[PDB]
Symmetry: C3
Subunit: 244 residues, 3 copies
């Protein structure tokens, strides 16, 4: 009667409040991830992952704690700090994280999120001698994430972090005059000590800047949903003979 | 009795949970908008608008789907990609979106939001020949939004997107040595194929960088509210004879 | 019976909804703060603080309204606009704010938040003659915040704003070739008209870029919590003889 109504209203509020909390907790993961990677702290990063978690970098999959520690630790921390937990003198690696769009599964057990970063990177002249030869002294970089999350034992965890670098620009010359200094993975671990456990299938492998490939949205069109159709709107614009 | 109390508490929670969901849904619109414009996808952008929606760009109003497709499509997509859905080889148009302050109307049917973007734009040397003559090869740009939202048939939609560009900086020279390459609208559609349906009244027309004009906050002072008065605090500072 | 269950469920929802609202209100403070400082509006900034609030800048504490007005007003507004409420012609001071991680106390009366800013700053050539001698014409800057919040009379307020600048880069040369043009505080107010009420204890004083110091996280590890231990993961990486 009145009590069936109260039960339905409570249950509905509990579900909605759960989803609002889930969104905050998933965003917190990605923002926390950012603050750890800025400090070259691979251990904190590995801890954010499910034990069967994966990170994807330059079309290569790194599997579990060991894989995450090999990417952020063996490769990145040696490259940027010589194997020190940061921050350290004269080394900038600020990955400004923003623009989260999170989609929680209806059952509350998994989620997707799109996010992005803009990286200001580099070695100050006082520590330039620590920089490896292949890398610009200072550069901008941007990338897109399309991540998967899993809820295990009440806790949101990274199930798949897929970082798809979009562009780099040497500070001095900019994105217009820079070719990426990173290329898609070619050699797996353990032949390549910095290498992935596996390379994505070729159809999924991405060439780097100035090459561009769409990263599909994990979110539906937020107004028209699955009913959105491109061809319903294209006829309203004019394609011109050349750019103006 | 006890049941009047339960009813009041449920109703109060339903209202607060509705407002929390409304804030997430309005932010999602603006973040989604960003990801679409970065890809030169005008169709997805037009779909975010109410059918009587308006976009304001350089002091010009573009009305409805047709107007939004003329701005993002006829003008922007031709300018940046030659009329291709992006992303495309060597063309960067990353509008990093952040700093949302959303104010939902008490009745839950409309809202305002302030947001901002920083744009990293440009043509890689490999596609520089596609760039129109008026536009720098690579540039930074920032702008402020003060938008209106409407809830129709249960869905948050853009009612007014008002993008007020604040500065541009050629990559090579920076904001200090750059004058905006865009000026306030002068000619409406259809005389100007890229033009607005109408130009704002003169009092509201904005000159561009290095000219600056306040964009009033859509939010009340979040601590003192309408009781905030500038003159209560100014006397505590010292104005100096010159900048130090 | 059924009514004890309904009471427990309501109370639990009221607590969770309160915390979700608290997070939005604390983020709103920091985003609002950003929009005010971009406009050189020290009065709005002072109003966000508790009356016993503190702002920390270059290892100096500025106490209460008077202190906040001396920093943002006496020092910053004179430096950037000659003592005018902004925005003004040719003066850019955009502090892009992002990456909030807020932790509300269990009792709902206090909170911590980590945030960050990237500042695009400078004088256009048309107003370069207004720039003080010590300051670059145009520069990037980034900083970290670890702030404290208090809830007083139902309203979230800034209890401690601790801005820890991390790097500056002259636009023309970048962070790699720039030394900070600001140094830790040396002289208190009123001997130094721009000075803090007190200088932090020496152990807490920070040298500026290219010097780097950790800013500890105010948040627990969001997956493993206090159980997180660095030494559980370090053995999985290889430290190399030199950076690669
Ligand atoms: C996988 O997670 C991320 C990875 C990146 C990298 O593309 C950055 C890492 O700083 C990188 C840039 C230049 C380099 O030479 C480099 O060497 C190995 C790595 C960025 C953000 C991420 O979330
Ligand atoms: C209306 O919505 C937006 C518009 C802008 C434009 O100011 C950008 C669009 O990329 C622009 C910059 C340089 C150009 O030459 C140009 O040519 C027409 C357009 C930015 C963000 C928005 O949300
Ligand atoms: C305390 O709050 C903030 C302070 C800063 C400053 O480091 C900026 C302020 O614009 C600054 C940069 C160059 C200067 O020469 C300068 O002169 C005094 C100040 C930045 C963000 C904040 O939240």
């Amino acid at each position: 009667h009145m009590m069936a109504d109260v039960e339905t209203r409570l249950a509905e509020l509990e579900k909605k409040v759960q989803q609002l909390e889930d969104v905050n907790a998933i965003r917190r993961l990605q923002w926390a991830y950012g603050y750890y990677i800025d400090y070259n702290r691979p251990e904190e990063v590995a801890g954010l992952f499910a034990k069967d978690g994966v990170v994807v970098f330059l079309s290569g999959e790194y599997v579990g704690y060991e894989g995450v520690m090999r990417l952020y630790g063996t490769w990145f921390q040696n490259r940027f700090t010589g194997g020190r937990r940061g921050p350290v003198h004269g080394l900038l690696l600020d990955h400004f994280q923003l623009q989260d769009i999170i989609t929680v599964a209806e059952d509350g057990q998994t989620a997707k999120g799109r996010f992005r970063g803009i990286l200001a990177g580099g070695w100050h002249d006082e520590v330039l001698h620590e920089k490896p030869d292949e890398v610009p002294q200072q550069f901008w970089e941007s990338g897109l994430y399309e991540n998967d999350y899993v809820k295990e034992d009440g806790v949101w965890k990274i199930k798949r972090l897929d970082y798809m670098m979009q562009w780099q620009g040497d500070y001095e010359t900019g994105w217009a005059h820079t070719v990426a200094h990173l290329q898609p993975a070619l050699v797996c671990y353990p032949e390549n000590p910095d290498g992935p456990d596996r390379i994505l299938p070729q159809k999924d492998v991405r060439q780097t800047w100035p090459h561009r490939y769409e990263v599909p949205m994990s979110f539906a069109h937020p107004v028209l949903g699955k009913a959105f159709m491109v061809e319903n709107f294209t006829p309203m614009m004019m394609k011109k003979e050349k750019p103006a």
